[PDB]
Amino acid sequence: AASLAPGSSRVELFKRKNSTVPFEESNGTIRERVVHSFRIPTIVNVDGVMVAIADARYETSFDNSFIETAVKYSVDDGATWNTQIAIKNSRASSVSRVVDPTVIVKGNKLYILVGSFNKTRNYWTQHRDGSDWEPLLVVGEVTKSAANGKTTATISWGKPVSLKPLFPAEFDGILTKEFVGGVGAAIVASNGNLVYPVQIADMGGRVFTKIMYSEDDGNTWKFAEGRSKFGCSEPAVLEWEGKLIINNRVDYNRRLVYESSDMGKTWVEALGTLSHVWTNSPTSNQPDCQSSFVAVTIEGKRVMLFTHPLNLKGRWMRDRLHLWMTDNQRIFDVGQISIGDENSGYSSVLYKDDKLYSLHEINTNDVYSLVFVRLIGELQLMKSVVRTWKEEDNHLASICTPVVPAACGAAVPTAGLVGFLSHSANGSVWEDVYRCVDANVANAERVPNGLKFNGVGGGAVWPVARQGQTRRYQFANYRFTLVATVTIDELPKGTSPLLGAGLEGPGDAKLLGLSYDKNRQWRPLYGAAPASPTGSWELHKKYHVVLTMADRQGSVYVDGQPLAGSGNTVVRGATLPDISHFYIGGPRSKGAPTDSRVTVTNVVLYNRRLNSSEIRTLFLSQDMIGTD
């Protein structure tokens, strides 16, 4: 998709300088007050009622202006809305405010956490101290009933409650100052635990993330021990296969993502899955932006939805808002869910009653409306690819392999399976069997399950970092397993590459690789180390080949058995390498002319090191895993 998928559309639900909200005077009276901007959208579903939550920024769009939490709800799928003002500010100054609503749904309830300010004019993290501030919790109770054939719903907003006396004065010996929810929608954990991602600003003004979670339903709260690197802000959270996944906003760099198996107590970065995949702009050096992050079950499959402005225009413009789906392996772009080049911003997404929606910002001359969008196109597009994965997976999980001599032996494992170049191959493109990352081929000709490479400047360029702004195979730099079948057609002139991972920047350096020489021998390249000859292939014989990288250690495989110098290092120092792509054959443009005569079929890719028992299996099954 280039822009908002046809069959999908929107209305301005919170119109700048237009939509009054019921403002409540000091003395209880209610007055329809105009609102300059509305910002910070969050749309969730409570018991069949759609709840939309935003900052009502009365006077100006400035983060530090007169604000209160506004709520619009609907029992007819956004067909009509009720408008409330859910959280009042302290009314202490011209600038008193309640900001940054963060949301947890549980049954008929809403838990909203907002920072609360009295007098300060500047950004909260720059505050001399945390004296102006209070973190308020407020519980929204939704009641459903029915009139004369109409469904009616109302919503009590409870009294706010400062969480302040539970803010530890120091974190591991770092004096805390103030904290706020991470903005947008949060989650209920598996054990029915209330789980906020918070953002914490220390006395020094530096910024980092955490998990605040309650066991007893908002009642009391505890801060989990684990945290992020500084520079993380506006974190979003979703529970996934045991762990929490914390997707952070990171100003002027890429989006760090952490996994926590132990309910926040200790965090590890999702190097081999999602971390660093998303950033703030093409150049990664512009301010970031908020992102929604939630678990939905599409077609029966458990997946993850992410929203984020490509923000080309740079700085705080946040144009081109995209939607993404991932099942923690394949990351799929579902195109753009805003209109034209327009300036979007903060966003939220909702899949309820098998319809798909987003609430999100549109800004024009720093004036802000929330658009309400029906993504009916985006959804079928989604439901489609789910099936591909669903069935492409189920297809390989019910296949019969030869009883390893020690009716079927071992399963062909799909746990971690990411990429697949099999049959479907087109003009200059080896099509992804999972539809996420494509390949760009030269000098090819089709065979059952592959492509035969014949000519000058010809080979498959399966981009990894060379994907641009969104680095979907980033994970590779920490661990991966690349697989391929090969028939070798003609003896090389001297040496000519085949299967491996190329790096970025100067020259033409490689992480890991297996070239081949004119003596019928194997050329395992292990980083910049000399690839000394070994083994003996033969022209036109079918050959399985496996590349595993984990913990910087690498091995090459020719038919189950590893190659000379297996157990080598491929990167030095604590630095993560910058794998450009993967190479099938000999593609190039800078410098040397590669001319490779191989037939390469059924190329796999996992986000981890496949094991002894798995490598042995896949090796014996390479005709039972193809497609037509």
Automatic annotation (TrEMBL):
The record ties this protein, via InterPro entries, to:
ConA-like_dom_sf, Sialidase, Sialidase_fam, Sialidase_sf, Sialidase_trypan, TS_C
Give the GO cellular component terms, alphabetically: cytoplasm; membrane
- Coiled-coil annotated spans: none
Q: Where is the Sialidase domain?
A: 40-361
From the record, give the cysteines joined by S-S bonds.
Answer: 400-408
List, alphabetically, the Pfam families matched.
BNR_3, TS_C
List, alphabetically, the CDD domains matched: Sialidase_non-viral
What Gene Ontology biological process does one annotation of this record name? ganglioside catabolic process
Q: Name one GO molecular function term.
A: exo-alpha-sialidase activity
Top enzyme category: hydrolase
Q: Which UniProt key words apply to this protein?
A: Glycosidase, Hydrolase, Repeat, Signal
EC number(s) from the headed UniProt entry = 3.2.1.18
Q: Which domain of life is it from?
A: Eukaryota
Q: Which residues form the Trans-sialidase C-terminal domain?
A: 413-612
| Protein name in UniProt | Sialidase
Organism of origin is: Trypanosoma rangeli
